[PDB]
Write an enzyme that holds these catalytic residues in place. Structure first.
Site, PDB file in Angstrom:
ATOM      1  N   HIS F 151       0.797  -1.214   0.000  1.00  0.00           N
ATOM      2  CA  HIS F 151       0.000   0.000   0.000  1.00  0.00           C
ATOM      3  C   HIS F 151       0.834   1.269   0.000  1.00  0.00           C
ATOM      4  O   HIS F 151       0.298   2.340  -0.303  1.00  0.00           O
ATOM      5  CB  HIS F 151      -0.929   0.034   1.214  1.00  0.00           C
ATOM      6  CG  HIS F 151      -2.045  -0.953   1.145  1.00  0.00           C
ATOM      7  ND1 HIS F 151      -3.142  -0.778   0.333  1.00  0.00           N
ATOM      8  CD2 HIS F 151      -2.243  -2.121   1.800  1.00  0.00           C
ATOM      9  CE1 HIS F 151      -3.965  -1.798   0.484  1.00  0.00           C
ATOM     10  NE2 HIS F 151      -3.442  -2.628   1.367  1.00  0.00           N
TER      11      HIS F 151
HETATM   12 ZN   LIG Z   1      -4.200  -6.193   3.025  1.00  0.00          ZN
END
Ligand SMILES: [Zn+2]
Ligand SMILES: [Zn+2]
Ligand SMILES: [Zn+2]
Ligand SMILES: [Zn+2]
Ligand SMILES: [Zn+2]
EC number: 3.5.1.98
Lengths: 183, 344, 77, 116, 322, 384, 48, 79
Positions: F151
């Site tokens: 992320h």
């Molecule tokens: Zn995740």
């Protein structure tokens, strides 16, 4: 009570500007390919020959110069949203880097001039200005506004920043968003 | 408290242990310190009933691990201020006015103040600074206004406008009401942001997190057949594409297809007929595929864009009927009128 | 509804019976008593009996009221 | 330069993260003076009152169940105490040429009552 | 018709409008003359060239070629400034997460302290086997020669005082000869006391896990009783058959001229299940008290007679099987 | 007519697909903790590793401790200012960096713990050394559970991820491989990795994620890449409670079509444990067999792969599934009886390797997944 | 200026006529330009 | 906050039964504190009595017993 007859095309342009800044989180391309001086100079050079009254010419040049001075002194105060104040800060630091003071005439585009026009009656009602000056300033602003309709396709265009680099608005970064609306 | 007891020549002899009991009994996530075990009050409901080999191979790793540095980039490659900003009316970190109860964001001022290069002693706002400038000067306000008008003889009409905004504190630009009232669909958010008809009513926390386990706003954790049935009619919400309502049977709940309704025309759509996995619970209003677009891009063969005109209140909106029936270049902004045997 | 609910149990009865009967517990849990017993004491485990027949007996006991709802659910789960 | 923090958030966008006939003022008031004086039912909604007792007894002893009749005894006693105190307050007010009980009127009553 | 919408999007809109009408949407598909890029997607927007120019010192030409720096996305932009919906978890799942949280707390603290004990005891067994004339000027580098520079700092700052932890770290860096054995002894005492508390807590954690875990893994079963009360009613069972009939009648006018003479289909492959349900019903009749004994026995032969008459089962088979 | 409902076949290894497995573990990774109330725990790495050692899996593989990344090497993807802030910020001097806290999204949902820089260095070094060992041919499978921070982006920290080590590993793979396929079976969308390689055709980023109002919000099916990276970013949106058979019948056709169409030279597999059933933040219903079937299926293609472990917020389940996946890469199936480790008390009540799925509704209908895979297959026709 | 945002009041039959007119225009301009390009290519191949 | 459960209209109802025609607005929050401290006196004694019987539950009998001590007897609940 002071009223301004802004055309609804320019009202929709201002509302779309509000949409792009607050909801779509878009700032303006600064400096624009068409600035504010550039609009207050072309309007003067267009309506200067429209009539042959020298007092009217003096009043028109007076209105243009006063609008320029008002724009420069009031842009940092009350003419730009909370998102664009970071861009204002970086412009001020970039101007201080090269030791030239920042003038909003040559930097900001015509949409901020339209913002100044739209917020102008509240500023008129907040000062001890006599009725004659208020009426004539409102009349000159209305004439500039109806001049803007004849050139609304060349100052306020509609372009996606994701598709065109020559759009009037740009998409912002997450870091700009965080610094602008996080502290 | 003399941690290192040095000798006369500076040599170390013996140190004293500091206060371990100062934080030996800090509350951990268990609610008790790590020094002690669980209490009986929580041992009652945790244990089932309460009355009143070392063949580890995990120590061999250090030995069996060979370092690895074979990458191509190895080496080198008084008054309390307010809790809201006085300029944008939003919370955040503020620079507080000393002789004034207003607080401003660091970016909201003119010029914006760096959060590391602060003013050393005192900071006054623009209104406060104008107040000290007026009180320090012997002449009254109208005298300075007239002097500023006469000195700035180049511009007369804007001179009163130029004078009065040095006293005004900087504020975030907001559109005036008469620019907003001409478009009735356009609303103002809680932070002053844009809002219009393509925006949902924000769901309160009573709906998101204060709901029962089986029943969730997502409508994916349980079989809910009271969504294929119209509330005000009692009929079955027939999906537009498949022309069916897959209600299921509660003995085969996998036979039930999820159905949602459009937020504009209330046309019910299955979650599979239009490819969607979410139910669009919050954010913008979901638009079914049958609605005409308000923004399209077409290829020039650059490009051209078209946006539908915003809705205007009835006092400033003119609906006009063309005289030309065929080939009338309307801007794409039209209205359909009812059609009134010869024409057929 | 009842027959479908019981048919789901009976159609998988042989594999769940073979899974419960061939439940080889790990050694260090037996040496260090780390495994529960609350369900074996109450004869709620399903070892040594057919799974579907034990479901029927447990449901009969639940109907008769001598068996709590929570213990019946825990045994089934 | 004094500064303060109000966002109270080290980072923004926390949500997007992974973790008509009308009576004169007083006539209705006297009417429901008569209504709540001719009546005998209990005026502080019960549940709320019971709770008041749980969170406040907790201090003296945990896990203290209360017989139902008890929280009804606490209610009765509390409503009797407050209606007596409010009769006295109205008096402590009608004393000072007035018709509006005010906090001061009850910090006094309790001083003369000696409950302070 | 205003030379605004492109033919591709018009065909897409009509496909969304007349998709199930295959014959009509083909008339149009061709009556029109459609023959079978720049798809950016909804969750990416393009930065200007000013925002791209940010110094990444480690990038070579290949890194500048294969890495995207103009198109970006953010969770706040994809949320439309609204937020996200977390998945709802049972209270048993929440207390399982709390048990895991306490477990992680204890194990993290104990293993960090144990790693610091290992490093400190390496330093101690190094410093024991040398004399005192050079033990005075012996120093220790940051990290104590370990691959971490902060783990021992965390352990010292926790075990000792907040303000005294820094000065103990500095005393260990400057004069480890006196500070190392006392720090090692205190860390070992804290280790054994934390481990005894961890075992006593491990008992409690294990018993709650045994109490909680299978209910936590049960999702539909935790709410099955209220769901079965709500959905096994007359209204929902009428709604299912009526919805299937409405679907059949809606799709009858489009195709499938031999309209089916049934809506619900039930399969009964096993016959012993009937005897099992009969035994359960008989158990409920024997247990219950709100029904009179004549009503009880009439219920019994009504159920037996209906099962023997509806299906192929005989009454003799029912009597011999129950 | 693309999706086929197929029951979950048992996991079987291929004896003709023996791979040299490199394991990257730094004993320090676990001694770092995001916070007191935080779901992300690096402690799951070493209980996963304790299951590797106690299963005797170290005799079939080589254990390496990768050199931690320096400041510049992190700047192969991230900016200088973000790495400079990450290497200097501590919980002590958090008030000294307030503008950078909201600039780089560090302080809330990505807290500042005092081993942040070292944790990121361990993760990035593990990923880059696994890619480097794959480049030189020293190993066929590189296993690094220290990373998985998919992320993290160029100048921000999101989703409990600070240093996007997967982008660094794919960068190191691209120096020797022309086409690198990234597969993300994490329940969240691999927004950082997809955003990094959005405009390039050299990296195909495939993400099998839940797409609702779930983090990070990105991952619509129409997100297929722009520019030269068009149709080179496959997004597979899934609903809640997908089981092993459904996930297999979605994963295997898509990855197979990518294999015979994109034809990659290296594979990066994000093994997020939050795709498992019973996760704190995940909403899927995968058992450990269902999670490991993706790793076993991608192992069958013979492409030199980098198995990198990502999410997983219940430590026991992610540790067990990582141990099973690691054992699967050595062409063995570990028995469902856990050996004695120092963290044996986590895996109650049965103390077995298996992660049991929940009985929750598989709301991913066959029609929806058929449409999803039909559009995905149609977009993949231009990747030859 | 309220005349700039005037909403056109159109009917269904006019939309039908306009849609038919414009599709017939588009179809036969592409058909006739294809015919003209075919004739031009035939002339080019004849002259070559 | 359970204290804020003693709502305004309820304090108004107590004033009405008490014959008050206009309640200041600052009274409402004074009546809470006075209420609390009083209940906090009875219930205290109610419990001393309770933990003298080694009972863990309190009774209404103990409540009227604590009232008798304070002075304000309550008839209608036993004793
Ligand atoms: Zn995740
Ligand atoms: Zn001030
Ligand atoms: Zn502000
Ligand atoms: Zn449908
Ligand atoms: Zn609709």
């Amino acid at each position: 009570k002071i009223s301004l007859q802004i055309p609804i095309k320019l009202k929709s342009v201002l509302v779309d500007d509000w949409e792009y800044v607050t909801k779509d989180k878009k700032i303006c391309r600064l400096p624009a390919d068409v600035t504010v001086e550039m609009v207050l100079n072309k309007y003067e050079h267009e309506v200067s020959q429209e009539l042959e009254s020298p007092g009217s010419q003096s009043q028109l040049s007076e209105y243009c110069a006063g609008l320029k001075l008002y724009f420069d002194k009031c842009l940092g105060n009350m003419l730009l949203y909370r998102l664009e104040r970071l861009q204002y800060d970086e412009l001020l630091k970039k101007s201080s880097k090269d030791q030239k003071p920042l003038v909003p005439i040559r930097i900001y585009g015509a949409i901020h001039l339209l913002r100044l026009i739209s917020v102008l009656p509240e500023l008129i009602s907040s000062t001890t200005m006599d009725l004659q000056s208020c009426q004539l300033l409102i009349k000159q602003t209305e004439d500039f506004l109806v001049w803007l309709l004849m050139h609304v396709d060349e100052y306020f265009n509609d372009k996606d920043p994701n598709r065109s680099d020559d759009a009037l608005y740009v998409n912002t970064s997450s870091q700009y968003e965080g610094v602008a609306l996080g502290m | 408290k003399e941690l290192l007891e040095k000798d006369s020549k500076g040599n170390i002899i013996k140190l004293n242990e500091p206060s371990t009991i100062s934080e030996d009994s800090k509350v951990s996530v268990t609610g008790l310190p790590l020094n002690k075990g669980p209490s009986e009050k929580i041992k009652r409901e945790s244990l089932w009933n309460y009355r009143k080999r070392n063949d580890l191979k995990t120590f061999l790793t250090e030995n069996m691990t060979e370092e690895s540095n074979i990458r191509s980039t190895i080496g080198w490659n008084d008054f309390e201020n307010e809790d809201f900003c006085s300029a944008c009316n939003q919370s955040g970190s503020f620079l507080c006015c000393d002789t004034c109860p207003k607080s401003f964001h660091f970016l909201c001022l003119d010029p914006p103040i760096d959060p590391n290069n602060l003013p050393k002693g005192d900071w006054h706002c623009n209104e406060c600074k104008f107040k000290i400038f007026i009180n320090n000067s012997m002449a009254t306000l109208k005298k300075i206004e007239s002097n500023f008008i006469k000195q700035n003889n180049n511009v007369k009409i804007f001179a009163k406008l130029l004078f009065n905004i040095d006293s005004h504190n900087p504020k975030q630009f907001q559109l005036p009401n008469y620019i907003k009232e001409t478009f009735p669909a356009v609303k103002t958010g809680s932070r002053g942001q844009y809002s219009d008809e393509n925006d949902k009513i924000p769901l309160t926390d009573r709906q998101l997190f204060n709901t029962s386990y089986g029943q969730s706003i997502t409508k994916l954790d349980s079989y809910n057949p009271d969504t294929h049935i119209d509330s005000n009619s009692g009929k079955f919400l027939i999906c537009y594409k498949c022309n069916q309502t897959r209600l299921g049977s509660w003995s085969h709940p996998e036979n039930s297809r999820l159905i949602m309704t459009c937020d504009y025309c209330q046309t019910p759509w299955h979650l599979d007929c239009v490819p969607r996995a979410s139910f669009k619970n919050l954010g913008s209003k979901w638009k079914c595929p049958l609605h005409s677009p308000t923004k399209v891009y077409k290829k020039i063969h650059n490009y051209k864009v078209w946006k539908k005109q915003r809705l205007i209140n009835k006092k400033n909106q003119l609906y006009y009927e063309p005289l030309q029936k065929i080939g009338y270049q309307n801007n794409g902004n039209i209205q359909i009128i009812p059609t009134t045997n010869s024409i057929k | 509804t009842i027959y479908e609910r019981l048919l789901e149990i009976k159609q998988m009865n042989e594999r769940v019976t073979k899974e419960i009967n061939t439940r080889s517990t790990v050694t260090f849990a037996k040496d260090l008593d780390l495994l529960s017993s609350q369900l074996s004491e109450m004869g709620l485990d399903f070892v040594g009996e057919d799974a579907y027949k034990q479901v029927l007996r447990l449901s009969r006991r639940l109907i008769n009221g001598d068996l709590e709802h929570q213990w019946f659910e825990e045994s089934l789960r | 330069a004094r500064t303060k923090q109000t966002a109270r958030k080290s980072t923004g966008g926390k949500a997007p993260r992974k973790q008509p006939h009308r009576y004169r003022p007083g006539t209705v008031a006297l009417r429901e003076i008569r209504r709540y004086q001719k009546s005998t039912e209990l005026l502080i909604r019960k549940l709320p009152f019971q709770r008041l007792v749980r969170e406040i007894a907790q201090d003296f002893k945990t896990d203290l169940r209360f017989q139902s009749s008890a929280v009804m005894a606490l209610q009765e006693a509390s409503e009797a105490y407050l209606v007596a105190l409010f009769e006295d307050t109205n008096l402590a007010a009608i004393h000072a040429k007035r018709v509006t009980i005010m906090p001061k009127d009850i910090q006094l009553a309790r001083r003369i009552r000696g409950e302070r | 018709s205003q030379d605004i919408l492109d033919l591709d999007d018009l065909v897409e809109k009509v496909d969304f409008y007349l998709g199930s009408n295959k014959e009509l949407f083909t008339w149009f598909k061709n009556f029109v003359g459609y023959q079978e890029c720049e798809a950016f997607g909804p969750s990416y927007k393009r930065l200007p060239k000013s925002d791209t120019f940010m110094p990444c010192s480690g990038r070579d030409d290949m890194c500048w070629e294969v890495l995207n720096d103009e198109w970006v996305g953010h969770p706040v932009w994809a949320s439309e400034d609204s937020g996200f919906i977390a998945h709802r978890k049972n209270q048993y799942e929440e207390t399982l997460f709390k048990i895991e949280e306490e477990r992680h707390e204890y194990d993290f603290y104990i293993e960090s302290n144990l790693r610091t004990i290992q490093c400190l005891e390496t330093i101690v067994n190094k410093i024991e086997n040398m004399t005192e004339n050079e033990k005075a000027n012996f120093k220790l580098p940051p990290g104590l020669g370990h691959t971490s520079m902060t783990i021992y700092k965390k352990v010292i700052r926790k075990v000792y005082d907040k303000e005294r932890g820094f000065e103990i770290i500095d005393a260990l860096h400057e004069h480890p000869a006196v500070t190392a054995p006392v720090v090692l002894k205190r860390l070992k005492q804290k280790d054994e006391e934390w481990r005894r508390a961890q075992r006593e807590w491990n008992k409690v954690w294990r018993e709650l896990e045994q109490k909680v875990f299978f209910k936590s893994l049960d999702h539909l079963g935790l709410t099955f009783k209220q769901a079965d009360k709500k959905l096994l009613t007359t209204k929902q069972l009428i709604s299912e058959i009526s919805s299937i009939k409405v679907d059949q009648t809606n799709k009858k006018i489009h195709w499938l001229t031999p309209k089916p003479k049934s809506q619900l289909d039930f399969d009964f492959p096993d016959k012993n299940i009937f005897y099992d349900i009969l035994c359960l019903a008989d158990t409920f009749i024997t247990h219950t008290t709100a029904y009179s004994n004549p009503d009880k026995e009439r219920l019994k032969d009504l159920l037996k007679y209906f099962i023997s008459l509806f299906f192929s089962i005989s009454f003799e088979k029912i009597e011999e099987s129950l | 007519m693309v999706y086929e409902a197929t029951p979950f076949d048992p996991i079987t290894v291929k004896p003709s697909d023996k791979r040299r497995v490199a394991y990257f573990y730094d004993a320090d990774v676990g001694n770092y903790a995001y916070g007191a109330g935080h779901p992300m725990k690096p402690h799951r790495i070493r209980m996963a590793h304790s299951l590797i050692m106690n299963y005797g899996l170290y005799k079939k593989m080589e254990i390496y401790r990768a050199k931690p990344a320096t400041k510049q090497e992190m700047c192969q993807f991230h900016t200088d200012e973000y790495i400079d802030f990450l290497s200097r910020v501590t919980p002590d001097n958090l008030e000294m960096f307030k503008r950078e806290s909201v600039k780089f999204n560090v302080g809330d949902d990505c807290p500042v713990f005092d081993g942040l820089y070292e944790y990121c260095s361990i993760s990035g070094g593990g990923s880059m050394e696994g890619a480097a060992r794959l480049n030189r041919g020293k190993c066929d499978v590189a296993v690094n559970y220290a990373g998985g921070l998919h992320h993290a982006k160029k100048s921000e920290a999101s989703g409990f991820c600070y240093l996007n080590d997967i982008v660094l590993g794919i960068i190191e793979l691209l120096r020797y491989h022309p086409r690198v396929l990234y597969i993300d079976i994490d329940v969240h969308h691999g927004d950082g990795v997809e955003e990094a390689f959005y405009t390039t055709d050299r990296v195909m980023t495939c993400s099998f994620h839940k797409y609702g109002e779930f983090f990070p919000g990105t991952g619509e099916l129409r997100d297929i890449g722009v520019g030269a990276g068009k149709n080179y970013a496959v997004n597979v949106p899934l609903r809640d409670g997908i089981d092993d058979a459904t996930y297999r019948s979605v994963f295997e056709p898509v990855i197979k079509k990518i294999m015979e169409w994109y034809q990659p030279s290296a594979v990066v597999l994000q093994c997020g444990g939050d795709s498992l059933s019973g996760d704190r933040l995940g909403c899927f219903n995968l058992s450990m067999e269902g999670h490991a079937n993706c790793v076993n299926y991608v192992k069958s293609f013979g492409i030199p792969m980098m198995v990198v472990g990502g999410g997983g917020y219940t430590m026991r389940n992610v540790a067990r599934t990582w141990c099973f996946e690691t054992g699967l890469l050595n062409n063995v199936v570990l028995d469902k009886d856990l050996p004695y480790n120092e963290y044996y008390e986590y895996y109650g009540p049965d103390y077995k390797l298996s992660v049991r799925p929940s009985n929750m509704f598989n709301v991913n209908t066959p029609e929806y997944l058929d449409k999803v895979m039909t559009n995905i297959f149609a977009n993949l026709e231009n990747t030859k | 200026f309220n005349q700039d945002f005037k909403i056109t009041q159109i009917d269904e039959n006019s939309i039908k006529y306009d849609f038919f007119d414009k599709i017939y225009k588009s179809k036969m301009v592409q058909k006739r330009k294809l015919f003209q390009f075919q004739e031009s290519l035939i002339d080019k191949l004849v002259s070559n | 906050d359970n204290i804020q459960g003693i709502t305004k209209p309820a304090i108004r109802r107590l004033a009405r039964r008490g014959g008050v025609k206009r309640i200041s607005g600052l009274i409402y929050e004074e009546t809470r504190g006075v209420l609390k401290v009083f209940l906090e006196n009875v219930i205290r004694d109610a419990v001393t009595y309770t933990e003298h019987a080694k009972r863990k539950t309190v009774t209404a009998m103990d409540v009227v017993y604590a009232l008798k001590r304070q002075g304000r007897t309550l008839y209608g609940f036993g004793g």
